[PDB]
Amino acid sequence: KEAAAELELLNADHQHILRKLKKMNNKPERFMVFQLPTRLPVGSIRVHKSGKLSVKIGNVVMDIGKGAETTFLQDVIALSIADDASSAELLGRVDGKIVVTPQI
């Protein structure tokens, strides 16, 4: 029922995130943050048949699910500090944020 509204939106999420992955191939000092599941029991973002993404970051450990999901009307900028010294440089602003979740 309303679970069928969910899978079609997750299809519409992959087709919006392969676009933003491919427009940023020109390495234009562009950054993005995404979360990896810690507490491990490297890999490869890869395209399945007909619009489907998955990562396999362990030797075997598959993580099928990804999603380009949050809304932020903020300015977000990455800076690297080093040893509390003359070490302040703004690297870049952040365009998007996706997440990784393992399948169960």
- Site residues (vs other proteins, CB under 8 A): 1-3, 6, 9-10, 21, 24-27, 29-39, 42-49, 55, 65, 67, 69-82, 84, 86-94, 99-104
**Which of residues 29 and 60 has its CB atom nearest to other proteins in the complex?**
29
Distance CA 26, CA 29 (A): 9
Rounded Cα gap, residues 12 and 7, in angstroms: 9
Q: How far apart are CA 14 and CA 50, in angstroms?
A: 10
Tell the smallest beta-carbon distance from residue 16 to other proteins (Å). 14
Residue 62 C-beta: closest distance to other proteins, Å: 13
